[PDB]
Amino acid sequence: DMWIERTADITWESDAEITGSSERVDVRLDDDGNFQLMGGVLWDTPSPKKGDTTTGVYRIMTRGLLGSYQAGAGVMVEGVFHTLWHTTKGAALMSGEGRLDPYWGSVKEDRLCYGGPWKLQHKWNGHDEVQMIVVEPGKNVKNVQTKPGVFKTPEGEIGAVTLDYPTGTSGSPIVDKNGDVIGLYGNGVIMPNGSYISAIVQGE
């Protein structure tokens, strides 16, 4: 029922609009993957697609008997598709002529990958501006540039971006100036003034 469509290259854009703000907010993370203001599962082996694993940025689409809608987005790097867990909850994804089955995910970290282990090892350097590759439903892909702030958790810190986009943009990748994916958009908190702030969702 769900499929992926390639829609952009993974790149830094020199003309991106600069927006957002660099906040600092105290949060805790629950075992369902929700942040509040203040583990990993290896999936079944296919066992016996061939989906398309071309590098790039992708929309996650779904449909029933009528038109389609955009459930989310993600990134294909080194033959593995990466998204937030909550976009698909582990559902299989068609990719071109074949199927991609989940490999590994964590509800609490809100991360899921298909085709192999997580390939994205780069992280925000804690200093520089970053770019979100915005995969908004119904719209062409564009990049926006921002300086992250920080979620302060009881154990540590996580980079966080004050950028609000509509439902279905979750899983859009965030890149550093080299064009390396430093994490994904779409799991955060709402502030008392209504501002939405997402973690830069990434492994170690």
Ligand X SMILES: *[B@@]1([C]([C][C][C][N]C([N])=[N])[N]C(=O)[C]([C]C2=[C][C]=C([C][N])[C]=[C]2)[N]C(=O)C2=[C][C]=[C][C]=[C]2)O[C][C]([C][O])O1
Return residues touching ligand X (CB under 6 A). 32-34, 72, 86-87, 110, 164-165, 167-170, 186-190, 196
| End-to-end Cα, the chain, rounded Å | 32
Out of 82, 86, 122, 127, which one is annotated catalytic?
86
Q: How far is the CB of 45 from ligand X (least distance, A)?
A: 26
Q: How far is the CB of 84 from ligand X (least distance, A)?
A: 7
Alpha helices in the chain (DSSP H): 85-88
| Residue closest to ligand X, measured at CB | 170
With residue 52 as reference, give the H or E element that holds it.
Answer: none
Q: What are phi and psi of 6, to 5 degrees?
A: -75, 140
127 part of the active site: no
82 with 185: CB under 8 angstroms? no
For residue 103, what are the CA distances in angstroms to 5, 83, 172, 182?
Answer: 19, 12, 20, 20
Q: How far is the CB of 168 from ligand X (least distance, A)?
A: 5
- Residue closer to ligand X by CB (options 49, 136) is 136
Spatial distance between the Cα atoms of 54 and 65, rounded to a whole number of angstroms: 28
Q: How far is the CB of 71 from ligand X (least distance, A)?
A: 6
158 with 120: CB under 8 angstroms? no
Active site members: 86
